[PDB]
Amino acid sequence: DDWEIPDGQITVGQRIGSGSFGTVYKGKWHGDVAVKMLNVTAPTPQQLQAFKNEVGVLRKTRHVNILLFMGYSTKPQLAIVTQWCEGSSLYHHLHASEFEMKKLIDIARQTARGMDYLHAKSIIHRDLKSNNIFLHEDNTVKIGDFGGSILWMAPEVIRNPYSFQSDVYAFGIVLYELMTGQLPYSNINNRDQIIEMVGRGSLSPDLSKVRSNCPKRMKRLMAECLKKKRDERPSFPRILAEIEELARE
Amino acid sequence: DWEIPDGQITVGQRIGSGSFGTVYKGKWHGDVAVKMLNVPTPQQLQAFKNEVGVLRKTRHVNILLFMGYSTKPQLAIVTQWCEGSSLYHHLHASETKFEMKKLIDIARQTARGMDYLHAKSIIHRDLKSNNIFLHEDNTVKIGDFGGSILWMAPEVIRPYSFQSDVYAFGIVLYELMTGQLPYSNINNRDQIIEMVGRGSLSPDLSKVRSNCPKRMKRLMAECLKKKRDERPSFPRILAEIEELARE
Ligand SMILES: CC(C)(C)c1nc(-c2cccc(NS(=O)(=O)c3c(F)cccc3F)c2F)c(-c2ccnc(N)n2)s1
Ligand SMILES: CC(C)(C)c1nc(-c2cccc(NS(=O)(=O)c3c(F)cccc3F)c2F)c(-c2ccnc(N)n2)s1
C-alpha cells in the first residue's frame, strides 16, 4: 500500500535525458530500473505538491502497455522509480533507423490498449508522441512520459485545452507515423507556420503518403482521429475495437 | 481501488488450475488472465482481501502483473496475459535450445523477481519451472504463489521460509543447466519423498552441461543445501549471477 523506497537501496547511474518533467537515469534496484529525479537543491512547496499528485496518478496504473511505476523516494531529491525498458522508442525505429504492416498494426493496437486503459481511469496523457512510446524488447509497447511536441498537438492545444479528445488526436498522428513512416508536415520547416496553419484549421496530415498495403479501415480511422473539431473524434473504446478487428480481418 | 465492476471482463477459454484457483484467458483493455476462485462467506471475503492485499504489493517486471479483482459475478483476480509458455515447457517439452547466455539471463531475471519478493517479505511457497512464464520468450514472469515435490526442500517434505524458496530456485537452476528434472533415474514419488526428506538424496550435479559456468555450479550447490540455514539469501544470489553475467 506504500511505495516509498527507502533511500540507499537505489543505485543511480548514467543520465539518459529529460522528458516532460524530471530527469531520468538508469538505476539499480532488485534489477534494472529507470529513475526520474527532480534535481533541485530543495523542492519548493509547489514542487512537493505536484510530486505527490503525479505519484498518486501513477500508482493507479497497472497495465502491460503502460510503463511500470515501481516506487518513489523523497530524499535527497524527489524521485520516481520505474521499470527499465530495453531498446528504443517508436520514434527511433520509425525515423532514426533502417517494420512490416502486421507489426505496425500490432504496435498501434498495444498503444490503443494502453490509452483506452488510461482513459477508463479518467487519466489524460497530455504528451503522447512516438517519442514517448518505448518498444520494450522491441515487442511490448510501453507508454510513458506523461504531462517539440507541436506535431502531435491538436488544433485547440496549439491555440486548459487538454482532454481525452486531444490524446486521441495525438494518437492519430502516431498512426500517421506508423502508416507513412514519416513525420507530418515534412514540407513545412517553420515552427510558427505549422502553429498558425494547424491552429488556423487549414493544415492537416497528408493521407496520400500512407503505404499501399495500409488497410483502408486504418486510413479511415486515422482521418477520424485527426478531426479538426474535437467532439468529432472517436473515443478509445471505438478506436481499440476497430484496430483489434481489422488486425484479424 | 482495483475492483473491476461486473460486466467489464469477457471470459474466454479455460487455461487450467494452479496452486489455487482456475485460470481463463480474458478481455479487459486487451488480453488478461482471469483466475476464478471457486466460490462468498463473510470470512471467505476476508481471506480474499488478504491475498489481494499481498498481490497489490508487487510492482516488478519479473513478477506477474496484478491488474485488479472481481467480486461479481464471482471472486476473481485479474492479471496481465503472458504470450508463450512456461520455462518448464521450453526445458522439458519443447526442447527449446537455449544458448548459455539465455539460460543465465533467465536465471538472473528469476533471481531479480525473487529478491524483490523477499525484500517485500513475501514467500512464494511454490516456485517451479512451470510457475515461471517466459512472456514473449524474453521476460521472466513469476506467478502462481502458494503434486510438485521436485522443488520441495527437505524441511518442507518432513517449514516455508525464504530458504525453501532458495532451494526451489536451486532446482530451477538445475533444470536450466541440466535440461532435465531432478532424480530422472528414479521414477518413484514415495521414494523421493522419503529420501529427499531424510537427506539421503540430492540432485545429481554430474549431469550439468560442460558449457555451464563453474560459478553457477557452486551457486546451484549452495542453493541446494539440505540444511536450511546454510543456504544463501537472494541478494547474494542475485549479485553472483549479476557478477557472472558480465561475460
Ligand atoms: C528520454 C526520456 C523521454 C527522457 C525518457 N524518460 C523515461 C522515463 C523514466 C521514468 C518515467 C517516465 N515517465 S512518467 O514519469 O510519466 C511515468 C512514471 F514515473 C511511472 C509510470 C509511468 C510513467 F509514464 C519516463 F518517460 C525513459 C525510460 C523509462 C524506462 N526505460 C527507459 N529505457 N527509458 S526515457
Ligand atoms: C494454471 C497455470 C498453468 C498454473 C497458470 N496460472 C496462471 C496464473 C493466472 C493468474 C494468476 C496467477 N498467479 S497468482 O494468482 O499467484 C498472482 C496474481 F493473482 C497476481 C499477481 C501475481 C501472481 F502470481 C497465475 F499463475 C497463468 C497465466 C498467467 C498469465 N498469463 C498466462 N498466459 N497464464 S497459467
Give an overview of the whole structure.
Chain A: The active site is at 127 (proton acceptor). Chain A: One of its GO terms (biological process) is negative regulation of neuron apoptotic process. Chain A: GO terms for molecular function: ATP binding; calcium ion binding; identical protein binding; MAP kinase kinase activity; MAP kinase kinase kinase activity; protein kinase activity; protein serine kinase activity; protein serine/threonine kinase activity. 2 copies of one chain form a homodimer. The first copy, chain A, is α+β, with helices and mostly antiparallel strands and 249 residues long. Chain A folds into 2 domains: 1-86, Phosphorylase Kinase, domain 1 (2-Layer Sandwich); 87-249, Transferase(Phosphotransferase), domain 1 (Orthogonal Bundle). The first copy, chain A, has helices at 45-58, 90-95, 101-120, 155-158, 164-180, 191-200, 216-225, 236-248, and strands at 11-18, 23-28, 32-38, 69-73, 78-83, 133-136, 140-143. In chain A, the strands form 2 sheets. Chain A has a 5-stranded antiparallel beta sheet, with helices on one face. In chain A, strand 4 and strand 5 (78-83) form a beta hairpin. In chain A, helix 3 (101-120) runs antiparallel to helix 8 and helix 7 (216-225) runs antiparallel to helix 8 (236-248). The A-B interface holds A 1, 3, 30-31, 62-65, 68-71, 83-84, 110, 113, 116-117, 120, 137, 139-140, 240 and B 2, 29-30, 53, 56-57, 59-62, 65-68, 80-81, 109, 112-113, 115-116, 119, 136, 138-139, 238. The structure holds Dabrafenib (2 copies). One Dabrafenib (P06) is lined by residues 16-19, 24, 34, 36, 58, 67, 69, 80, 82, 84-85, 134, 144-146 of chain A.
